[PDB]
Amino acid sequence: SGFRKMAFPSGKVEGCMVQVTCGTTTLNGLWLDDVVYCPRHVICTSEDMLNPNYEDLLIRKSNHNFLVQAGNVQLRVIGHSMQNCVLKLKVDTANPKTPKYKFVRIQPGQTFSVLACYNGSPSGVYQCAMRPNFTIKGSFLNGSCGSVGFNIDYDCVSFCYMHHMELPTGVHAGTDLEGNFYGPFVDRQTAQAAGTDTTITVNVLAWLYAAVINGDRWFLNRFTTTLNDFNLVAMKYNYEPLTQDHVDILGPLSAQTGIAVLDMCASLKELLQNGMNGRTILGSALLEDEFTPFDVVRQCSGVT
């Protein structure tokens, strides 16, 4: 009973967080095996920020300029390299707390947990979605760069995001763990257009199934729709067009509840066209899109 915006347990990631200082700037690093990963802008100063020449700035740095501290203990840096927008600092000691892990590039519309950190110390954990336009709407202040996003499958942490930037709009941008930005963004202090965003339709449908499972059923109706008809409504309301691949991933939820996907689409269509009429669904007064079908199945079945 109940449905919450649940994050993965953060302990495995907490054991990987370190502080990285280069010159003036301190941000977070991720220590896995004998490598510390961090955003490359740790090597910048204020005059560099409008458009840093990262290759030249890094040429001025030596291994001993990267101060890496794992809580109390200092790590000895024996190599450094820049890969896309991340720095990889080779250290002489493997992290004893390295969990089983993978680096993955997530798709827009997928969700993950963020462990927000400052000075290598964890502050809090929250769940969010990668928007269809590749931005994230997080909670990050100065010093949070290098905090990571991740998912967990049994004892394996799949790292998918490293935080690099707050755009002038207050929205967030970052990279995969190979330093490739999600979206069109570059690590410099400039206004940068984020694409037109959309609402993640398959996630809203998954959340309506979570609602029915938990007893919030007022939005169920006597109607059905088709993919074509629903997609005309999705177009009007700036929702992602629904495909058979999305219908297929909703199969487990349709099977559990007995509510055909297109019948749930007809509920969503009515909610888009009429609003909530001052009512709530799972404690929300809007249509929630930060739960994937996998998240709903996991939370509704108690996966550990």
Add this chain to the structure above:
Amino acid sequence: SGFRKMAFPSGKVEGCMVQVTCGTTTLNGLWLDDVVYCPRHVICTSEDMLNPNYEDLLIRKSNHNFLVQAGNVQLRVIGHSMQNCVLKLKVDTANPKTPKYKFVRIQPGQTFSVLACYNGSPSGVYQCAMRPNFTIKGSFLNGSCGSVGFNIDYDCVSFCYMHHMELPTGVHAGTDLEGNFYGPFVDRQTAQAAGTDTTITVNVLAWLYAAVINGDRWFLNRFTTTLNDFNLVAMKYNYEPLTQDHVDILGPLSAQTGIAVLDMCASLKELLQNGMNGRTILGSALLEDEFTPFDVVRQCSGVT
């Protein structure tokens, strides 16, 4: 930039979770030092649930009947005692991962993080409020009993909640770590009245300050109010009456934003009387009450 429903990092609590089995039933236990704490209903069977005679059921149990497993390793139980609705199982080994901790009884209206667990394994973490009527609106399934709620202050975990029950309404009830229920509840399978609940006014005001800090300002107006006038509106809308102690705890937010507490009350009064007119505040289409003033200051300042 940004404001999220952030939970505390769960690692310190993950290291304390164990599985407790007595007879048929398996639930979670909390291992701190050489004691494992768990809900006493682990000793019940189905015929007991309507009104268990806990003293008689426990008299049938011996130390060797409590199977306690910390992941892979088995703990040896050398004593057992029932304190209110919790069992305390003395074990022969102190938990090496015991963090600095306290047991606290929280006040209604305060918030905490829950580490939802099944079979002693963490599933996810979320933040919630203890309702004014002492219930919690969590996400808990069968097997989640014994999961705990907590707050963290530097390296000290203050445990405040242990999950015991899902009421027939789907709302949740539990105890402090001495086994005393929050609210009028008893650990038996019966319908039990939860008091009339209210919205946590001081938390809604704190969240409106978080909104202004993050740039959501549309609800600010040219008005002011008084405590008396605001409390007439709070009465109508089932909000907790605001006191000077609440105004005082909002001081830091009023000081940071320059918006007097009673002026923010006038914004809240207008929102209660007129609604949101289809707009959102910090991604919500309702007035959020699960952030205390302390939570807002912590998240807005990056406390670790």
